[PDB]
């Protein structure tokens, strides 16, 4: 069922409402995904003015159904299996020596469009720290995203470490703890342990005067033998 919804290019919409240390903001995104190649292309806009956190800190929060699952691993693709009814994705993101984000999102189809709707809450940030102080470089590293079943919840548990480059040459670690649960009562695929290999490139639209981020991302499932 879910797999067939992703054989072509699918339009994507992302909507996020955020509150980080009382700095409220909203972000809207649009683009398309082609899961055949693990490929996402999106443009995000801060619709409330200036984004009060660095764009890179939002990349993980702002559609893992667009991951390329090798044919020999297709039975481990929870994300697509939950579609079109979708899944709830929840995270805590711990910024080392700083505050944390807590996010709740719903990812599902609305007609032919894959939609990610997100509420984000950030607390305990340092006004002078790398996040609220805007000390992070506008770029993004390549990661491994670790996935396990959570049979208790008929869902998955996910963990990984994001490394954000700091302007002084150091790293800002962002420890990610995640769980997904299906929205239907329909069946889903519960996976064996595996991981997703990610890479992302951030850019700017030279004509865009609003605070924004252009994102090109490729993700491939791995760690099972071929
Ligand atoms: Mg097995």
Alpha carbons within 13 angstroms on the beta-carbon side of residue 219 total: 24
CA distance 77 to 158: 13
Residue 24's beta-bridge partner residues? Answer: 19
The Å distance, Cα 157 to ligand 1 centre, comes to 17
Number of H helices, E strands in the chain: 1, 11
Nearest to 157 by CA among 183, 178, 188, 182: 178
Q: What is the DSSP letter of 86?
A: -
The Å distance, Cα 144 to ligand 1 centre, comes to 20
Resolution to 1 decimal, in Å? 1.6
Between CA 116 and CA 153, with CA 160 as vertex, the angle to 5 degrees is 60
121 with 143: CB under 8 angstroms? no
The Å distance, Cα 110 to ligand 1 centre, comes to 33
Method: X-ray
The Å distance, Cα 224 to ligand 1 centre, comes to 9
The Å distance, Cα 92 to ligand 1 centre, comes to 29
131 with 125: CB under 8 angstroms? yes
The Å distance, Cα 184 to ligand 1 centre, comes to 25
CA distance 97 to 174: 10
The Å distance, Cα 109 to ligand 1 centre, comes to 29
Nearest to 137 by CA among 199, 202, 198: 202
CA distance 29 to 18: 14
The Å distance, Cα 226 to ligand 1 centre, comes to 13
Structural domain harbouring 153: 1-225
The Å distance, Cα 56 to ligand 1 centre, comes to 35
The Å distance, Cα 192 to ligand 1 centre, comes to 6
The Å distance, Cα 75 to ligand 1 centre, comes to 10
For residue 135, CA distances in Å to 8, 40, 83, 129, 172 come to 39, 26, 38, 8, 10
Kindly report whether the peptide bond that precedes residue 22 is cis, defined as omega within 30 degrees of 0: no
CA distance 25 to 1: 36
CA distance 160 to 89: 15
In angstroms and rounded to an integer, the radius of gyration of the C-alpha atoms of the chain is: 17
Nearest to 46 by CA among 57, 55, 38: 55
CATH assignment at residue 103: 2.40.155.10
Nearest to 221 by CA among 151, 140, 154, 146: 146
Q: How many domains does the chain have?
A: 1
The Å distance, Cα 150 to ligand 1 centre, comes to 15
Dump the DSSP string for 189-211.
Answer: PPPPSEEEEEEEEEE--TT--SS
Residue 214's beta-bridge partner residues? Answer: 43, 203
27 with 58: CB under 8 angstroms? yes
């Amino acid at each position: 069922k879910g797999e067939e919804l992703f054989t072509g290019v699918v339009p994507i919409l992302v909507e996020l409402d955020g509150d980080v240390n009382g700095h409220k903001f909203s972000v809207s995104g649009e683009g398309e995904g082609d899961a055949t190649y693990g490929k996402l292309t999106l443009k995000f806009i801060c619709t409330t003015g200036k984004l009060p956190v660095p764009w890179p800190t939002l990349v993980t929060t702002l559609v893992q159904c667009f991951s390329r699952y090798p044919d020999h691993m297709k039975q481990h693709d929870f994300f697509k299996s939950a579609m079109p009814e979708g899944y709830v994705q929840e995270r805590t993101i711990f910024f080392k020596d700083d505050g944390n984000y807590k996010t709740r999102a719903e990812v599902k189809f609305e007609g032919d469009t894959l939609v990610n709707r997100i509420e984000l809450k950030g607390i305990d940030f340092k006004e002078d720290g790398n996040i609220l102080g805007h000390k992070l470089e506008y770029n993004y590293n390549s990661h491994n995203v670790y996935i396990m079943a959570d049979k208790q919840k008929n869902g998955i548990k996910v963990n990984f470490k994001i490394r954000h480059n700091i302007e002084d040459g150091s790293v800002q670690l962002a420890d990610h703890y995640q769980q997904n649960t299906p929205i239907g009562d329909g069946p889903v695929l519960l996976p064996d342990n595996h991981y997703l290999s990610t890479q992302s490139a951030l850019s700017k639209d030279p004509n865009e005067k609003r605070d924004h981020m252009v994102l090109l991302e490729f993700v491939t499932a791995a760690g099972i033998t071929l």
